[PDB]
Amino acid sequence: SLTCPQIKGNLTPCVLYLKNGGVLPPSCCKGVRAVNDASRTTSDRQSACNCLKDTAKGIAGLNPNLAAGLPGKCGVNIPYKISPSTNCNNVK
Template identity: 55%
Template sequence: MAIVKVACVVVMACMVVVALAPFHAEAAITCNQVRGSLAPCINYLRNGGAVPGNCCNGVRSLSNMAKTTPDRQNACRCLQSAAASMPGIKPILAAGLPGKCSVNIPYKISPSTECSKVN
C-alpha cells in the first residue's frame, strides 16, 4: 500500500511539472528574427554615415519583439553572435544605434555586455 501511495505522489508531481511547462519563461525571439530585423543596418554598422530609415524600423521592431527578460537576454546573445560573425562591424556604431533611432534598449549593445544579467 505504501508503494502505491509513493507512486501516486510521483505521478502527481510529474503531472504538475508537465502542466506548468508551458508557463516556463523561455525566449520566443529567435536569432533569425534578430538578424532579419537588423539586416538593413549592416552597411551603416560597417561604414557609418546616415542611419537608413528601414534600419531604424528594424531596431524598433526588435525592441517591440523583445518585451520579456528571456527575450531581451536572447536578443542580446543573438546580437553578439551576429556581430562576431560579420567582419567589419564597428562596436561604437552598434552601441549608438538605438539612440540614433530614438529607441530605448535597456542594455548596452556591446561584446562585453553580460546578456545573462539583462533584465
C-alpha cells in the same frame, strides 16, 4: 518574442552603416525597433541580446561605437549594447 533568425533579418539593412557610419537607413531603425518591441520579458531581452551579440560577431569590422549608439538614433533604448562581447546574461 522574435527568434534569432528573425532578429538577424531585422538587422541586415544595418550592416553597411554598422561598419562605416554615414547614412543610417530607416529600414535599419525599423528593424532595431522591431527587436525592442518584441522584447517583452526579461528572458526576451537576454535572448535578443544574445542573438544580437552573435549577429555582431558575424559583421566583420562592426564598429562598437556605432552599434552602441544605434538604438538611441532610432528612438529606441535597449538596456544593453549590441556588441560582439556583451554580457547578456545579466540583463534586467
